Protein backbone atom coordinates (compact mmCIF):
# COMPACT_ATOMS: atom_id res chain seq x y z
CA UNK A 1 0.00 0.00 0.00
CA UNK A 2 1.42 2.84 -1.08
CA UNK A 3 -0.03 6.51 -0.71
CA UNK A 4 0.13 8.30 -4.66
CA UNK A 5 -1.42 6.13 -7.07
CA UNK A 6 -1.77 7.46 -10.64
CA UNK A 7 -5.11 9.53 -11.27
CA UNK A 8 -7.06 9.73 -7.78
CA UNK A 9 -9.92 12.44 -6.84
CA UNK A 10 -12.56 12.37 -4.40
CA UNK A 11 -16.50 12.62 -4.74
CA UNK A 12 -18.01 16.08 -3.09
CA UNK A 13 -21.58 16.18 -2.54
CA UNK A 14 -23.70 18.56 -0.39
CA UNK A 15 -26.52 17.77 2.06
CA UNK A 16 -29.97 19.26 0.19
CA UNK A 17 -31.66 17.77 3.37
CA UNK A 18 -31.68 17.52 7.39
CA UNK A 19 -30.66 14.46 9.11
CA UNK A 20 -29.73 13.35 12.99
CA UNK A 21 -28.00 10.35 13.08
CA UNK A 22 -29.14 8.10 15.53
CA UNK A 23 -25.90 5.89 16.25
CA UNK A 24 -22.03 6.82 16.21
CA UNK A 25 -21.32 5.07 12.97
CA UNK A 26 -23.68 7.46 10.83
CA UNK A 27 -22.77 10.94 10.48
CA UNK A 28 -24.89 13.87 11.85
CA UNK A 29 -25.64 16.51 9.36
CA UNK A 30 -27.89 19.47 8.43
CA UNK A 31 -29.34 21.32 4.89
CA UNK A 32 -26.78 23.45 3.93
CA UNK A 33 -23.43 21.06 4.29
CA UNK A 34 -20.69 19.69 2.09
CA UNK A 35 -19.07 16.18 2.67
CA UNK A 36 -15.95 14.10 1.22
CA UNK A 37 -16.81 10.78 0.38
CA UNK A 38 -13.71 8.82 0.54
CA UNK A 39 -15.09 5.30 1.22
CA UNK A 40 -18.01 4.73 -0.50
CA UNK A 41 -20.14 1.70 0.96
CA UNK A 42 -22.45 1.55 -1.92
CA UNK A 43 -24.33 2.73 -4.70
CA UNK A 44 -26.47 4.38 -2.18
CA UNK A 45 -25.04 4.93 0.84
CA UNK A 46 -21.04 6.82 0.86
CA UNK A 47 -18.63 7.65 3.05
CA UNK A 48 -17.34 10.87 3.66
CA UNK A 49 -15.97 13.58 6.40
CA UNK A 50 -17.55 17.34 6.70
CA UNK A 51 -15.38 19.40 5.01
CA UNK A 52 -12.85 21.09 6.91
CA UNK A 53 -14.03 19.03 9.94
CA UNK A 54 -12.58 15.67 9.86
CA UNK A 55 -13.53 14.55 13.34
CA UNK A 56 -16.86 14.14 11.96
CA UNK A 57 -16.95 10.68 9.57
CA UNK A 58 -19.72 8.45 9.30
CA UNK A 59 -21.94 6.84 6.20
CA UNK A 60 -24.96 8.68 4.74
CA UNK A 61 -27.55 7.98 1.89
CA UNK A 62 -26.59 9.80 -0.77
CA UNK A 63 -29.99 10.24 -2.08
CA UNK A 64 -29.75 12.70 0.95
CA UNK A 65 -27.25 14.42 -0.91
CA UNK A 66 -26.49 16.08 -4.16
CA UNK A 67 -23.29 15.85 -5.99
CA UNK A 68 -22.41 20.13 -6.35
CA UNK A 69 -21.50 19.57 -10.26
CA UNK A 70 -19.79 23.53 -11.31
CA UNK A 71 -20.54 24.31 -14.88
CA UNK A 72 -18.30 26.55 -16.48
CA UNK A 73 -15.25 25.59 -19.09
CA UNK A 74 -14.60 28.65 -20.82
CA UNK A 75 -12.15 31.02 -19.04
CA UNK A 76 -13.25 34.23 -16.84
Same mark, same amino acid.
Given at each position: ? /? =? +?? =? ?8 ? #? ?8 ? &? %?? $? !? &?? @?? #? !???? @? &?????? #??? #????? &????? $??? =? $??? !? %? /?? /? +?? =? /??
Amino acid at each position: G /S =S +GS =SGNKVRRVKT #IYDCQADNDD &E %LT $F !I &EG @EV #I !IVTG @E &EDQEWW #IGH #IEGQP &ERKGV $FPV =S $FVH !I %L /SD /S +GP =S /SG
